[PDB]
């Protein structure tokens, strides 16, 4: 199988302080891009029977179907995208060894005999579900969550890099990992960081994206997604908001609920389908962990469960340092009164506090955020306990 088609990953510029070194590095990257475009264009310019007859035999147009059975070497059971399936022949030129139940055979428009196979069929949905440009966020952009980052690296990175420890100890690599916690703790940021540092194919999925209107399209989409992940091995599948489909299993009455249950049973089956030794891992995030099915999180399916607690005081100050690392703060800003206040501040809340403090600074015609601006911002962004006096 073809290896991992990772993201673009342009080299990171380290200074970021708007200095000469940043100019040097950015100009170097631009120089290399220019010599790349020059080469590609010039090599486009420089230098210029049976195939045509086989194209004629194929005809025009040629429909695309999914192979499902192969009775003999000259007959098979293909299914058109509509849903209908036919007992069709395989012409000689079709390379047989590529025929494997679940491929994308090319079918003649009339008498749908197999005239070819499509190695890459990936439908637009699963194609956009594949990460092409790595997110700019990085582990350096994550404050705190040292244990969480360590666990995710042990889960989806250590088997990818030197894995000899895993079989040296005899334990299996953790097939799949799920992140949970209150909203805004860093579940999606930690997946962005993984995608930025990964060396494998990263497949971002919304979870609710897998559900499709037409009957059989949901399980087909899930099957295609994981088939791409395996064929793109090594790969990482990030199904964000798994609770969109991960809710408690209950007996279904309507057709739509039956289709939803079918899609999730397909996802669970295909999660069981690949071995843990395989280099395809799944990563799922949710806020309502308690509402998930107690079969998607089975120890035999998703062993790890990375908790994302609301940041503590030191993690709060780390996040504040990270998000104020690009500000022109004054010398008066303590930043300690804010992390003092016993609240439920999260990473998102701290980032919004920083943004609001910047907006207060703009409101004063000044570009140097002060302690007073942070003070008003914290109250401004914090929305909404025990009556005051009961608990001293």
């Amino acid at each position: 199988t073809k290896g991992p088609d990772a993201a673009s990953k342009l080299p990171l510029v380290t200074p970021h302080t708007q200095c000469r070194l940043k100019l040097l590095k950015l100009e170097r990257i631009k120089d290399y891009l220019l010599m790349e475009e020059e080469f590609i264009r010039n090599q486009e310019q420089m230098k210029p029977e049976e195939r045509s007859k086989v194209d004629d035999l194929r005809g025009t147009p040629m429909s695309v179907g999914t192979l499902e059975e192969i009775i003999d070497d000259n007959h098979a059971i293909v299914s058109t995208s509509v849903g209908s399936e036919h007992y069709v022949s395989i012409l000689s030129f079709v390379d047989k060894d590529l025929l494997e139940p679940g491929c994308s055979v090319l079918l003649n428009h009339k008498v749908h005999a197999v005239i070819g196979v499509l190695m890459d069929d990936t439908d637009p949905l699963v194609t956009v579900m594949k990460v092409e440009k790595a997110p700019q966020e990085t582990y350096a952009d994550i404050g705190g969550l040292d244990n969480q980052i360590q666990e995710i690296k042990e889960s989806v990175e250590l088997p990818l890099t030197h894995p000899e420890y895993y079989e040296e100890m005899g334990i299996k690599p953790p097939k799949g990992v799920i992140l949970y916690g209150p909203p805004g703790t860093g579940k999606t940021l930690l997946a962005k960081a993984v995608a930025n540092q990964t060396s494998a194919t990263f497949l971002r999925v919304v979870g609710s994206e897998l559900i499709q209107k037409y009957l059989g399209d949901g399980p087909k989409l899930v099957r295609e997604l994981f088939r791409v992940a395996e064929e793109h091995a090594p790969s990482i599948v990030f199904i964000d908001e798994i609770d969109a489909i991960g809710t408690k299993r209950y007996d279904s009455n309507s057709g739509g609920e039956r289709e939803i249950q079918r899609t999730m049973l397909e996802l669970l089956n295909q999660l069981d389908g690949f071995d843990s030794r395989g280099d395809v891992k799944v990563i799922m995030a949710t806020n309502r962990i308690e509402t998930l099915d107690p079969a998607l999180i089975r120890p035999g399916r998703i062993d790890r469960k990375i908790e994302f607690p609301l940041p503590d005081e030191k993690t709060k100050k780390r996040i504040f340092q990270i998000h104020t690392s690009r500000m022109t703060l004054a010398d008066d800003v303590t930043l300690d009164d804010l992390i003092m206040a016993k609240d439920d501040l999260s990473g998102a809340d701290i980032k919004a506090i920083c943004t609001e403090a910047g907006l207060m600074a703009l409101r004063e015609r000044r570009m140097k955020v002060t302690n007073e601006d942070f003070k008003k911002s914290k109250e401004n962004v914090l929305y909404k306990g025990t009556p005051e006096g009961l608990y001293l």
């Binding site: 708007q18 940043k22 475009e37 049976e50 090319l106 120890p299």
Partner: protein
């Protein structure tokens, strides 16, 4: 203090005022970087798919043209009631997938004998007459029906389910190993047992252990498979697997996750077909069925009626001795010290299923990996059981 909207002069001053001299150049270079990257991605493009053309040594192009002209394409349909053909009404209801249902005759090629209800019929596209039956030819090495002959797990591997393993031994061995004893005790050999218990208790593993001891091949069938895409001809699936089991020597049929099947038109076809293959098939056969699901009631009431599945083995969460035995069994395959107090770990995880125990061992291995140590210590197992199990209160009021 009313907020004052930023005037155009303020906008102009704030933009430039304090700024890096290089900032303009930086911004321009970064924008040019993005434009250049877009240009590269635009000018590479058009990656050739190169469809599955075999080397020209295999192209009999004239023959493909002739088979295109001659060989008709047949749509695949699911057959239904025979409507009493008997050479007087040679008609059948066939459901052509999502297209429609029809009532069609035979073909000169086919015969009435090999066409019945339920198999895959290849109908034509004009008259829709059944032109060739296409048995699913399932024999599924691409999916479930484990078909494992002698599972690697043995009698020593299973730990804790001693009462359970003894009841299983009785039912699926004493007839299988000593048929004469049941014959001379005047009783039909146990037709089967339903192994019910909380999930992860290991009932599957205990069954595979006795299968390895019986030296009879172990067949494990999942239910979700034939709930999902491979629905319909599941009756023919179980037909062919029971048939090959008859061709096979002494066997051990095992249905796990059968709750999905038991809990229904094609599904109902599947269990009435297994009724035909259990009641209709003589109960004296060596294809003993091993039913197993957590649900003890979701099974269809017509299934456990006498003359069928006869007893039920109640698996329960392993006890302290069971838990330490499971811990030792799972740690045998791990690089750990020789002085690990597995009784301590068994104590620390009460009401813990076997799957939880294997996850605890895996987490102990991961904890040992974390400190970059080739040997896992007892502290690693303690931390693993602290992490997995439990997902001041018990230390300050109890003592």
């Amino acid at each position: 203090k009313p907020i004052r909207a930023l005037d155009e002069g303020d906008i102009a001053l704030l933009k430039t005022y304090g700024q890096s001299t290089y900032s303009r150049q930086i911004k321009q270079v970064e924008d040019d970087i993005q434009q250049l990257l877009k240009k590269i991605n635009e000018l590479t493009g058009i990656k050739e798919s190169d469809t599955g053309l075999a080397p020209p040594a295999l192209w009999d192009l004239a023959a493909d043209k002739q088979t295109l002209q001659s060989e008709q394409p047949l749509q695949v349909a699911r057959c239904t009631k025979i409507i009493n053909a008997d050479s007087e009404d040679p008609k059948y209801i066939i459901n052509v997938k999502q297209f429609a249902k029809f009532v069609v005759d035979l073909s000169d090629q086919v015969a009435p004998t090999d066409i019945e209800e339920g198999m895959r019929v290849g109908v034509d596209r004009n008259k829709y007459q059944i032109h060739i039956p296409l048995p699913p030819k399932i024999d599924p090495t691409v999916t479930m029906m484990q078909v494992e002959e002698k599972p690697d797990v043995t009698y020593s591997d299973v730990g804790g389910c001693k009462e359970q393993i003894e009841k299983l031994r009785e039912v699926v061995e004493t007839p299988l190993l000593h048929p004469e004893r049941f014959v001379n005790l005047g009783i039909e050999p146990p037709k089967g047992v339903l192994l019910f218990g909380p999930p992860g208790t290991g009932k599957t593993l205990c069954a595979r252990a006795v299968a390895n001891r019986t030296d009879a091949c172990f067949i494990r069938v999942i239910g979700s498979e034939l709930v999902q895409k491979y629905v319909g001809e599941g009756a023919r699936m179980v037909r062919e697997l029971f048939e090959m089991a008859r061709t096979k020597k002494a066997c051990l049929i095992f249905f796990d996750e059968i709750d999905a099947i038991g809990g229904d038109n094609e599904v109902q076809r599947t269990m009435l077909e297994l009724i035909n293959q259990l009641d209709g098939f003589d109960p004296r056969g060596n294809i003993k069925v091993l039913m197993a699901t957590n649900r003890p009631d979701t099974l269809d009431p017509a299934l456990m009626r006498p003359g069928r599945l006869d007893r039920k083995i109640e698996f329960s969460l392993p006890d302290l001795e069971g838990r330490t035995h499971i811990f030792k069994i799972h740690a045998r395959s791990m690089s750990v010290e020789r002085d690990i107090r597995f009784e301590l770990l068994a104590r620390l995880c009460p009401n813990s299923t076997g799957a939880e125990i294997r996850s605890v061992c895996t987490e102990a291995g991961m904890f040992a990996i974390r400190a970059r140590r080739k040997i896992a210590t007892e502290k690693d197992f303690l931390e693993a059981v602290n992490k997995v199990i439990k997902s001041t209160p018990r230390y300050m009021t109890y003592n």
